[PDB]
Amino acid sequence: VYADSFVIKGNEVSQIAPGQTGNIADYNYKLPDDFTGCVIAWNSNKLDSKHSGNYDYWYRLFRKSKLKPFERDISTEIYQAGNKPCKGKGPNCYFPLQSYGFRPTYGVGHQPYRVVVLSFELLHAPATVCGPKSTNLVKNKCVNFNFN
Amino acid sequence: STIEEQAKTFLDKFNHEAEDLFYQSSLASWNYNTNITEENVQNMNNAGDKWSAFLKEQSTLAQMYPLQEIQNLTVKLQLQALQQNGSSVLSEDKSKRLNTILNTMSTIYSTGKVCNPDNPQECLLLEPGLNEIMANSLDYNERLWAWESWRSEVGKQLRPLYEEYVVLKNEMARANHYEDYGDYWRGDYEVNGVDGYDYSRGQLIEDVEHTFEEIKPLYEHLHAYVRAKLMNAYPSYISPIGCLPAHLLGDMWGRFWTNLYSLTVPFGQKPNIDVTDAMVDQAWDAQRIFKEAEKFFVSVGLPNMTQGFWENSMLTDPGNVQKAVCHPTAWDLGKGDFRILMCTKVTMDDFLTAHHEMGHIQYDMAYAAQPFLLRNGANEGFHEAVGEIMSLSAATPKHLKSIGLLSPDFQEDNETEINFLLKQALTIVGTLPFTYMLEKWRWMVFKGEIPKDQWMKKWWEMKREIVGVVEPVPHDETYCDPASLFHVSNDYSFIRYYTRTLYQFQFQEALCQAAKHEGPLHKCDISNSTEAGQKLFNMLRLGKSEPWTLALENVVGAKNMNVRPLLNYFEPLFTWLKDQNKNSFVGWSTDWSPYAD
């Protein structure tokens, strides 16, 4: 069982679903067409908030291609959009990572939300992770029993 | 790669980097307007300097994207809006001098006081001053003095400053590939690129003149009806065939004729509709007014408000050492933050001002999904029209009776309807000819067809020709009276008011015809109707990415402005005025003057 967690805005919650496109579901984290898991999210506005801007969360926005399902990318290169070679930040050279800056004075869709994804795996291996149901014991009676 | 992808990337990055700065500037402005302290002033100045530096570093950099190679309409419009240089084409010395002149004129206009001639120690302010004096007064000499001293004290120290301001504006217009300031003002009503929806800066003047040619008879009849009672009000003062004095229109400038309702009442024996006593007896407050406004706006098919709208807005005057401005303004801070600053009292005008502010907030929330460069209305007076079409619907006797403010034993007669129509006319039509004359005079001054030694002469000629008002005392070319107005001294336009006055009636007729209303037009009500709400939301969601012509055609089915709604609304009042003036005289002579005898 794998547990994936990330922090996004209130409007980007609908993008985390099998069969969705955009910026977060195509450049930061993409889900495959088939995924037998659960998506859990909640409001964390009062937890992750600070006055004068909270510039601690980053995200990838500009890239040359898209991300495959279950792919990691921690590249910090300079994106190129023209025909001239990259020689530092300037014309046609922008930083791929941007900050959010969450504040407790925003609306209802511009708040930080913590989303947790749980992935299940079943291969040719013993299953030591099960789920939960025990009753009492009676004696001197013709009853039905079940001992493991 | 291509230029379109780079342009879209640059626009997205600009929006992402400017949204936070705009939010910070709005928060600083809100903190300055809520609490007047030195720290708030410093924070507002710092935010303004940062925004100016951002606009400077973003300008003169996006010029690498030609407009002749862009095929997308939205991208082309955004690039054209971002490539506007502005006052940066001039030198630093000229810009500094212009800013100094602007600050000096603002300080002079904001600091005004008139002292008594017989007692130099008795100096009165403006608002606890000449405004309250002209509000309630029954003397001729007092109003004449309050007009003459006002137009002579604050109307003789702004002539060369205004001349230099006009010269600098003309130079800036000629430097930005324009003709004059009038072209820069009319450039907002320009749509190029879409076939069948083009609009130039010359057709608007023709349409305004064509509408004025039909409005003029109604204004003449109204002026005759007003003079018929003004002759009996002030004996030996009003001429039977002459014009009217400038210090008797109701206020200092004579823009609104609301103060003349007490003297021009058709039937004084009939009671008036005052829901103030009912609200005092029921012990209401601003919260109840806002709740009623919300229930009214939701019943037509509009979403509810947010929690921050109620937990962050200031809807009650604190009444303490903390000073604030009680001017009702709509604020759009962004990121889902909408606040209203208003000192709401238990009166009748506040009940309509709350609905106006709620309509402004709904309009601002309508285009919340548009990009940062498109979060604006299709026209300047569009927000005011959307607010007025709701304020007039909320000010109907049926709506007040359905909520329990009016007694069920009220018998609606014809005299009450005539009085209501006259009160609405003296407020709506009483400002259209003056606005048109002032706008035409400003356009002729900015164009350069009027010599410098004939400004006041042409001003008084246009006055006596359009408005029909003669001055009590002749003034030479040393005065600067036309520049004594707030909108004139702060670089504001006036065609927006006329466009809003037309669009409000157009939208009212559209909504009353779409809701399948039967009977008179002044008895129409858009309450409990989802079709009209959906039809309005289908147009408010456009914002600024679509031309105003298409948005108007999708609502009323027309591309240009029309005056038929106003005529259909005032037909009963017009017939009543004609029946009353059948035994009276219509017209006025421009040769008569109070200083002729």
Q: What is the residue-wise DSSP string for B300-345?
A: TT-----HHHHHS-B-S---SS-------EEEE-SSS-EEEE----
Catalytic residue among B294, B357, B388, B509: B357
- Least Cα distance to A16 among A30, A5, A4 occurs for A30
Whether residue B442 is annotated as binding a ligand: the answer is: no
Residue B108 contacts residue B484 (beta carbons within 8 Å): no
Residue B536 contacts residue B363 (beta carbons within 8 Å): no
Catalytic residue among B142, B412, B487, B571: B487
CA end-to-end span of chain A, whole Å? 24
E-strand ranges in B60-164 read 114-115, 123-124
Whole-angstrom distance, CA of residue B497 vs CA of residue B216: 18
> In the PDB record, what is the listed experimental method?
cryo-EM
Whole-angstrom distance, CA of residue A41 vs CA of residue A113: 7
Radius of gyration of chain A (CA): 23
Chain B residues lying within 8 Å of A62, measured CB to CB: 9
Resolution in A: 2.7
Interface touch B335/A91, C-beta < 8 Å: no
Q: Indicate the angle between helix axes B286-298 and B349-366, nearest 10 degrees.
A: 50
Interface touch A81/B13, C-beta < 8 Å: no
Whole-angstrom distance, CA of residue A126 vs CA of residue B8: 52
Instruction: Work out whether strand A97-99 and strand A2-8 pair parallel, antiparallel, or are unpaired.
Output: unpaired
- Least Cα distance to B31 among B364, B317, B361, B333 occurs for B333
User: Is the minimum CB–CB distance between A92 and chain B shorter than 8 Å?
Assistant: yes
DSSP helix/strand/coil, B191: strand
Q: What CA–CA distances, in Å, run from A137 to A132, A141, B273, B374?
A: 19, 11, 82, 72
Whole-angstrom distance, CA of residue A111 vs CA of residue A9: 6
Q: What CA–CA distances, in Å, run from A117 to A70, A100, A132, B258?
A: 12, 22, 21, 65
What count of other Cβ atoms lies within 10 Å of the Cβ of residue B494? 20
Q: Is B475 a catalytic residue?
A: no
Whole-angstrom distance, CA of residue B290 vs CA of residue B344: 10
Output the CA torsion sign for B82, B385, B274, B225: positive
Residue of B9, B335, B365 to mutate for A, most A C-beta atoms under 10 A: B335
Residue A99 contacts residue A1 (beta carbons within 8 Å): no
Chain A residues lying within 8 Å of B336, measured CB to CB: 106-110
Question: What's the gap in Å between the CA of A35 and the closest CA on chain B?
Answer: 31
- Least Cα distance to B205 among B463, B560, B568 occurs for B560
Please, is B551 exposed, middle or buried when counting C-beta atoms within 10 Å of its C-beta (0-12, 13-18, 19+)?
buried
Residue B253 contacts residue B437 (beta carbons within 8 Å): no
Interface touch B6/A53, C-beta < 8 Å: no
Q: What angle do CA B193, B3, A87 make, to 5 degrees?
A: 150
Q: Give the H or E element holding residue B135.
A: helix B132-135
DSSP helix/strand/coil, B156: coil
What count of other Cβ atoms lies within 10 Å of the Cβ of residue B429? 18
Chain A residues lying within 8 Å of B368, measured CB to CB: none
Would you give the DSSP letter of residue B199?
B
User: DSSP characters for chain A?
Assistant: -EEEEEEE-SSSSTTSSTT--SSHHHHT----S----EEEEEE-TTTS--TT-BTT-EEE---SS-PPSS--------EE-SSSPP-SSBTTEE-SEEE--B-TTS-SSSS-EEEEEEE----SS--------------SS-------
Interface list for A 17-76 with B (CB within 8 A): 53, 61-62
Chain B residues lying within 8 Å of A105, measured CB to CB: 27, 308, 312, 337
Q: Is B487 a catalytic residue?
A: yes
Interface touch A81/B336, C-beta < 8 Å: no
Letter string b/e over residues B329-355, b meaning 16 or more CB atoms within 10 A of that residue's CB: ebbbbbbbbbbbbbbbeeeeebbbbbb
Sheet with A2-8, edge to edge strand ranges: A2-8, A113-119, A38-43
What count of other Cβ atoms lies within 10 Å of the Cβ of residue B207? 15
Whether residue B291 is annotated as binding a ligand: the answer is: no
Chain B residues lying within 8 Å of A104, measured CB to CB: none
What count of other Cβ atoms lies within 10 Å of the Cβ of residue B376? 18
Whole-angstrom distance, CA of residue B296 vs CA of residue B402: 12
DSSP helix/strand/coil, B469: strand
| Residues sharing a CB contact under 8 Å with residue B487, sequence separation 6 or more, in sequence order | B493, B494
Whether residue B327 is annotated as binding a ligand: the answer is: yes
The first and second tokens of residue A66, run together, are: 């898209």
Q: What are phi and psi of B191, to 5 degrees?
A: -125, 115
List A97's β-bridge partners, or say none.
A60
Interface touch B6/A94, C-beta < 8 Å: no
Q: What CA–CA distances, in Å, run from B115 to A104, B126, B153, B222, B368?
A: 51, 11, 10, 37, 50
Q: What angle do CA B360, B363, B369 make, to 5 degrees?
A: 140
What count of other Cβ atoms lies within 10 Å of the Cβ of residue B230? 19
Would you give the DSSP letter of residue B114?
E
Q: What CA–CA distances, in Å, run from B26 to A4, B29, B84, B170, B335?
A: 37, 5, 23, 32, 11
> DSSP H helical segments within B340-431, as ranges?
349-366, 382-394, 397-402, 414-428
